[PDB]
Amino acid sequence: GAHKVRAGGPGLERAEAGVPAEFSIWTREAGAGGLAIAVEGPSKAEISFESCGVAYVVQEPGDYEVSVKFNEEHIPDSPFVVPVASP
Amino acid sequence: GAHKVRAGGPGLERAEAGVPAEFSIWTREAGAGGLAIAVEGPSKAEISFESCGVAYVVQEPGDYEVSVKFNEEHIPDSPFVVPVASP
């Protein structure tokens, strides 16, 4: 049921180091399950939840990958490649 | 004051891989302290809070142990042995 979860927003295509990057996840059509957000790149992220919202901050510029996985399977289009600009 | 915390619910006796398993924790009689929920078994869990609720998902079938610890002491009946069925 990972194909039923979708995500979108500016934080899945660009960010800026030190500036929260945001996107939403659409949950209405999805079943129940575990939802994991990971960021992988040249530095560590803080990632918060808040359909749901996700905000994340990385501290260094570089190319990052954001995955959204539902019961350990990539949703459509995950992983997202996000270039992160210098602050 | 760990003996004053109690927990119960279907998620302390069975689960299904990929399906959120749920139980509640009764906090009314308890003091203030740190409350930790751990799941230990053949795969990793996502565990959320939501008296309080706990929902967790594991991805593989097998025997798991769920502990609820208050200031690092098992509450009554913790650890809970939970067989997890295939999805």
Binding site: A32, G41, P42 | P20, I47, Y56
Partner: peptide
């Protein structure tokens, strides 16, 4: 190669 992750349960 750093990984950070956060997790929730969807009901």
């Amino acid at each position: 190669l750093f990984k950070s992750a956060t997790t929730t349960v969807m009901n």
